[PDB]
Amino acid sequence: ELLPYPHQLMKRLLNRISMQSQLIENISMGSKLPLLCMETELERLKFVIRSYIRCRLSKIDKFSLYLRQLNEDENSLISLTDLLSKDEIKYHDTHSLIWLKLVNDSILKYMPEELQAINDTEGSVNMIDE
Amino acid sequence: DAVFGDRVRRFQEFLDTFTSYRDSVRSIQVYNSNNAANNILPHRIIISLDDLREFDRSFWSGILVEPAYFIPPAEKALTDLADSMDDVPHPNASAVSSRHPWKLSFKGSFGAHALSPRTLTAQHLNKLVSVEGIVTKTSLVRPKLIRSVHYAAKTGRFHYRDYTDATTTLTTRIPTPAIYPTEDTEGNKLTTEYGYSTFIDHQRITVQEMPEMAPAGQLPRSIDVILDDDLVDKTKPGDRVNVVGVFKSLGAGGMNQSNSNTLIGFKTLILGNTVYPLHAARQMLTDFDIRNINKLSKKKDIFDILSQSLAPSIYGHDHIKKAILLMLMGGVEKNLENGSHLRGDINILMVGDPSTAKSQLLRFVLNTASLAIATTGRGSSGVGLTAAVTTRRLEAGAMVLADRGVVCIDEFDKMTDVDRVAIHEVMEQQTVTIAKAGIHTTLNARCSVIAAANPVFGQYDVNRDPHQNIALPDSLLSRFDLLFVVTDDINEIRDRSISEHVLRT
Amino acid sequence: MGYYDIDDVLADGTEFPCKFQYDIPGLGYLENNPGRPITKNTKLSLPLWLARILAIVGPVPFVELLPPDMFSTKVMNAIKTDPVALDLHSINSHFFSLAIKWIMLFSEKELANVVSELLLQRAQELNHHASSLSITNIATSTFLLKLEEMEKEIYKKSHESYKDTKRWMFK
Amino acid sequence: MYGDLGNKLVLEAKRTKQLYARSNQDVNLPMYHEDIIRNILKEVSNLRKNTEYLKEQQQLGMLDDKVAKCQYFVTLLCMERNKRCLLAYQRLRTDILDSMAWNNNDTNNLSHQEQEYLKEYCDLITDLKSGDLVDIDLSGSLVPPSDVFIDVRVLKDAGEIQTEYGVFNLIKDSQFFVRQSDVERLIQQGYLQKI
Amino acid sequence: DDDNTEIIKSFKNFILEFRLDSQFIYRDQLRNNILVKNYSLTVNMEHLIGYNEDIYKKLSDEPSDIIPLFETAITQVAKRISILSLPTFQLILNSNANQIPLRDLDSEHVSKIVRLSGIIISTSVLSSRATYLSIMCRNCRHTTSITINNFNVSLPRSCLSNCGPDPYIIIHESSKFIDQQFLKLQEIPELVPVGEMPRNLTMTCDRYLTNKVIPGTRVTIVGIYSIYNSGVAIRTPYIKILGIQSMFTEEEEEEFLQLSRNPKLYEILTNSIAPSIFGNEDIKKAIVCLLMGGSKKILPDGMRLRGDINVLLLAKSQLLKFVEKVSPIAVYTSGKGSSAAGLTASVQRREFYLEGGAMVLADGGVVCIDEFDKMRDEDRVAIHEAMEQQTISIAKAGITTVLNSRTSVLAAANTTILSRFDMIFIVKDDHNEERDISIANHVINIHTEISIEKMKRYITYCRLKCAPRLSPQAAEKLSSNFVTIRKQLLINPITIRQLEAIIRITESLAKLELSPIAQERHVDEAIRLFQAS
Amino acid sequence: MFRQSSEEEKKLYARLYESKLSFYDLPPQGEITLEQFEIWAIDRLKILLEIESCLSRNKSIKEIETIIKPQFQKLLPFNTESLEDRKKDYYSHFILRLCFCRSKELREKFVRAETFLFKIRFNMLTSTDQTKFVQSLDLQFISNEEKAELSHQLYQTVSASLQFQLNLNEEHQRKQYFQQEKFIKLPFENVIELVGNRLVFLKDGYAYLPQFQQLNLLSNEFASKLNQELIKTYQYLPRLNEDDRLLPILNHLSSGYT
Amino acid sequence: SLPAHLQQTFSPEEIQFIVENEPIKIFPRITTRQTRWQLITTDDKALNNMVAMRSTEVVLWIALLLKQQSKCSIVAPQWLTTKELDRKIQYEKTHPDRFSELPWNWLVLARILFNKAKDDFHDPIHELRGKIQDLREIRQIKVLKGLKYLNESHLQLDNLSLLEINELRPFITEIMDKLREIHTASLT
Ligand SMILES: Nc1ncnc2c1ncn2[C@@H]1O[C@H](COP(=O)(O)OP(=O)(O)NP(=O)(O)O)[C@@H](O)[C@H]1O
Ligand SMILES: [Mg+2]
């Protein structure tokens, strides 16, 4: 499944990254080895976050209709904004519209009105993955 | 030694559990006991290897991987079952000591051990295997001694002894010298009682991989098989066959002192346990077939239905189709009380223009008759078409091979006069007779002949006599029951119908 | 069993034998004649995505499913004698998918017990050929021609895993 | 029958997936099957015409309770199975294009809707890459950093070029000893090798 | 006694310890072999020499004695790396020592390791040798066993458990065996002294080295050179072998598919056929159709519909050679044939036998005849069956058999025999001096569009992937044209056997596009190209 | 290495026939019909009548086994998983207790016939089933040192028996078997029938018995415990007299032995 | 978005990255104790307060970074010695089902230290390279026995290393999933 976003941790980490970058620039403009350690540590820190966010976006691609259906359910025990970050919300929303426009014009424009829905649960095969 | 008894017990439990084998034992026994009071069925049973798997896996794998230690006790238990069931009293002298137990055979699901002569390998020795191929050679049948009985002149006591050889038993024993004892332990002179002694039949064959599987024009490979008792003479050369048996080795392999420096290998064989043919003709009717056949026969016009169902891909020629159907049914062969014979089988000839489906229609009979041989008229000689000499031995031709069948001859007009006259006997007396250096014999050839030809002028000429168009002697045309002339007459609607038909086809 | 899965899309198109329980006008196009009715006790071969519904919707439903040849008794005996030697690829390209679909449809108990053993026994040799890395081709290639489309994916993702580890270690 | 064209179309999806998976460097997704897709859509239009005619016969009263219900229902299934095939095929080619968009952020094989789709998704990627979270290069390398300094050899004569760390002069078959964090992009572009 | 244990210990420690950089190459190979049930090890001489030269010295002095010790050492290691039963493992060797020419082997080389090369000319069937063997003692009925190994033995005579002079027999029911095979090696053709026929040797291999080569292949061999019993005090030499040396991808069919959608593909293939020959457009078109062929079909009543094509040509020598090169399978012959079988087949003699000519031998492929007028008398009549039926049938001198003749015939010459062919054409010439000068300049150069292999592979791909069917429009068109020509001839012959030829040409034309249906576009070109006259 | 992790009446009879034979040890429970009572008793009675008839005709064990074994599948099945067969066997034995506890002659005849049937069925077992059945009855082997010290006497005692009873004509085979054979030590009075035939070795009042013999101890324990249970059954016959519907059946069953 | 080979698993590079975050003991050849390091994912005091030839503990990636130059020397872990590896092999042979209790990163750390720090061992390195191999071979036998218990419910493993698990992950999970699908389909 897609696990809930750590809202607080990410705020604090990203602020710390910015401050460390400015400190490295100030010391550089001011023995070599401590600078080497600082530079490569910042690389090691940034790699983990990059991998993590790419994985989460990949999960959002695969469960887009499921997340939308979970949000549309007024009786849901959790809101979509609890689960996703603001950037993730933007990506999910606009990517769904792009994909929808592509298939709607290309295929579904030609189908009869009973089969024009994209997120149909009632058909002979369920169109929603989870 | 004690393990042999437990294996006999375990197979007895199997025979009690799966009851369809008891019915088989009992039915063979009661059938043989009935006609004996007036053919006889063999003392052999075929077991499904799947039943044995579901009954006891430890016995199943034992039969299939260590047959020398599991087949003998199982076979012993079968004999005890058949012996305990009721049997006719007061047996004769030969029956009392026949030395004739019952024997097993197998079917179903051999798995990895289903093989071919190319792939049979030294890893498979002493395993139970199934092989497939073509029979290429067969030995003469010979009798073999296994037990002899003797009467002692003074004491009035009957004595006996048993013999063994390496191909007679799955397990291995000290060989026996094939000598008859002349004198008793106590010095009494003995006599041999033939008719109370027991002899069995023996035959060796050879099986080769099918030519369809031969790689790269390489030499083909083959195996020798040993048959005995009931299995003798159930095959002939050219048969496609599937054989079941134990794969085994023999002899001293040159380790008994020899000049070879032991580079030569040991000899090997398959001991025939069961043999099955392959279809590569006959069918057996079920009850439903008899019902359907009898019901269909009461339609008003069965002849039209059946005749039009022959070669539906060929348009027209209704009457020739009807004639072919009547040929396939045939008349009735008569033998009168004074030995005189009256013919029953129908011969048909058809002659006509180019492209008018003569060869195409002739080809259909070859794929619906139960026995059929095909030949072209110029590719065959008179002796090859009837019989020829070799070494003295006399060898059959095509008309002798299709005895109770049909022979198809295409391009009949190209056959030379010297070849045609060999056929005049076969189409009426239905025999072939040879009188050549060192040979005189008669052979049977009862078939029906169907053939196709081209007219003399390349197309049929209505403005000349039929004898001018058909260059064959009157004595030969007389032997064909129906002679059909067919032509390609140009007409609009006929052309349209035929062309649309072949395009739909 | 996802919607957009190509293998599931492709496996649902295999045909199964069927028999009708009502005569119906105009549906002769199933019998490749649009101008005629279907008649009761007619037998036809239909794709599974259609037969799976016509066997259920009513009472008596429109179609009855006949036992297909790929689940015949001969195949079961072949499976139970030696599962490793068996040429499942020739029997049917998508065997373990159709097996699960048929089990769900009829809730078979014994077929599940046969199929579970078949999979478990073939996984062993599949791992053997996955583990064996060169520092051979014929010995491996003879068995890898008898794998299902289902089994090939497991073999590929195993071989790559072992190979990546080996490459990293000896580097 | 109405599913044959779909069963033929999906085989191209399986084929292009295997061709793509075999060689990650050689991505050129093949010609869009405009003609087969057009034939499938024409078949759907034929089925729609048949249902409409059947509705006219239903309003005329032609045994509509059983006959129109069964014929209509059977027709509906034939349309749904065609929708599934078309969506599966288009979804596969979409996944391939999304994969290329992340690295790149030529056109002739893509259908025009796909040609605008790719541009839209590139706009989305650069929107995420900008703004907040800009400090981490979301389109950068996914392999963990092993070493700070490496030796790289000069494979293509791109001449003198500029980069955020400085300027380089790529004299063919010269060799640099330099930090990887700088030359990672040039290695990906293909001017350099690690030796 | 102890030397047998020290040597085994030494080779055991060799396998357990030889690293080159960071991988224990022989431990890894031995483990990876067991997982695929391969019980052997391929050692390399140079590594053995590098590890310890003394071991190699012992091996080089007495190979017959020391090879078995190294084999049992391999077994002892194989158990440790896989068990917390196995046969004895086969040792295999690789070497780079100087090759000896086969003609120079002599009495100085007996019982030495030798490396040589040549051509394999014959292969025996497999035969069985014993390794573990069980014995029964005839008098006391005591039992024992023996372990053979195959290096240069007889049954013993020390009776046990008096017990007699020669009491032992074999229990074949409880013994183990292996495979053995014989081969013949002939010296290299480019080595033989002039005016002499090549010399050859006989040799043996067992277990995994069996069934590894086929006749006619050039090979390199490593083995012990030795003698065996079979003049005075004289013996035959031989060799014991220890080592031997001797469908489409996706990226391929993508090119073939790109060719298939080219709007001028028919022109491209015609242009690619014998490009040096000037003019003769329709000849080239007909050869494309002959190479591509129609589609075979089988009906419910069992009748069978032909797929092949047949063409006749009345300069012409070059095209048959080109067809022979481009075709996936091909046979070339002149009208008299390669033997008394002629083109078709014949019976020969002493018992009689039968052999087939170059119609039976080309079954499944293409055959081309260089002068069809030089056909023999028997072949003149027999080719009718070979072409109409795709069979040859004989019933002569007690032989009674039928032969398959499934092939497409190309023929040339300089009568009624023309009726057998689908198309007939007459070759045409032009006399441009530049053409001859260009040919002459190329001849001097050697004395001082699509390529063939790509086209052959494309033809193979199309034959494997597609077999197209007539559309209804084509059927109406063809039938209307057929009745039109017959009516025109009637008011002034065409026959069904030629309509069924036009259909095959039509299918072959649709096959290039890989279109599953044939269309009026193809029918038009088919009847247009039908103008043989 | 990898690692994972009334009904009572039916279970009772499954337990009682896991060994395939029983000493008939325990009180039955639940219900069966009166027709079943009569028929089951008569079936076992027919088998025991034929056993006593053959013994009165002085036929051997092999002949009696040939005569009686076909009757199990019809009257009283053996080596069977069926709950009905197991209940039929068990209940029929218990019924004939109540029929044949009534007098010393009836008790002796029933004990003799039932013990011989026990012997027959024990012979039908596999050696594994025999071992498991003996072990289930909670039924002293000598040490290897004592066997070695007495090896000459024990081998002299059993060598003829090994040849005639186990067909070991070869002395080599007899020696190998004797090397593998175990021996039991017990007071000589417990195996006195083997003592009178000099089939066991005697030392200091103890008899030394090989493991391939000694089935007479098992059958004698069966006979003795059955006799004691019949004596007990006799003592509480006044409680049987509370259901009149059973007494005619028991009188009929006993009349064939009087 | 994410590569196909990283959908369900970690590559060996990520496994090396994970192992590199552990602490290790070193001897420095320089004194830093009175610029400063100012790290943000670790302690900073240890590196700022080094004294020459005084033992101290730091993360492994910095330790290898120092050992690239003269300024540092790495102490081998105590389990990575001939005596301990002998005892672990004896444990492996004695208990034919249990796995011996080696640390979760033993393979990775051995094959890092043999490359970067071949000079700092006390034992002869050509013996350690043999005993590591013996351990891996015995453990592979035990793994091959265990793959006959894949089932519909669960499995227990003990002391199996991270790299050893990651090697097997895509096989075990896939076959187990399909057995689960086959079983539950019969219930429904
Ligand atoms: N209804 C039909 N009438 C005539 N010919 C047909 C018909 N249907 C198919 N044919 C074709 O006619 C062709 C020639 O048939 P065939 O039987 O060889 O003629 P034929 O009488 O043997 N001519 P020939 O070989 O010159 O003596 C074959 O290719 C058949 O497929
Ligand atoms: Mg013809």
Ligand SMILES: [Zn+2]
């Ligand atoms: Zn002896």
